Design a protein around this ligand. Structure first.
Ligand code: 6NA
Length: 133
């Protein structure tokens, strides 16, 4: 199920992150810092509890969740959202809801790389992560 996602991942490419951040209403000064940042994502499991850490020189987040169980999340850009993470077609789909809006964060393994697709409104961002061993 989730075991191929587990580990430490480092960003190696990013397309259209600015467009996604603009769509969410992130201010120009935070978008500048975010365009140069190369986060590390750590995904860990303990039984049926996942933990997802995102580390960087700018901002750090951590969430723990069970698949298929809604949780409260405060995002890096300070949205208060209702979240759920599920396995769909082998992808890890994270849906965030707030104020009648949605965004999806979809993680898929392709050729040993982690591809993160971020959709909000018309904005689509693809991030590519490589595994640190
Ligand atoms: C608004 C949060 C963006 C997360 C982007 C990433 O994990 O690469």
């Amino acid at each position: 199920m989730v075991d191929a996602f587990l580990g430490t991942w480092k960003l190696v490419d990013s397309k259209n992150f600015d467009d996604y951040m603009k769509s969410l209403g992130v201010g120009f000064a935070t978008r500048q810092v975010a365009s140069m940042t190369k986060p590390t994502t750590i995904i860990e499991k303990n039984g049926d509890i996942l933990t997802l850490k995102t580390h960087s020189t700018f901002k750090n987040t951590e969430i723990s969740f069970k698949l298929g169980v809604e949780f409260d999340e405060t995002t890096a850009d300070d949205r208060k959202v209702k979240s759920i993470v599920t396995l769909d077609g082998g992808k890890l789909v994270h849906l965030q809801k707030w104020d009648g809006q949605e965004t999806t964060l979809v993680r898929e393994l392709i050729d040993g790389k982690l591809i993160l697709t971020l959709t909000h409104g018309t904005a689509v961002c693809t991030r590519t992560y490589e595994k640190e061993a």
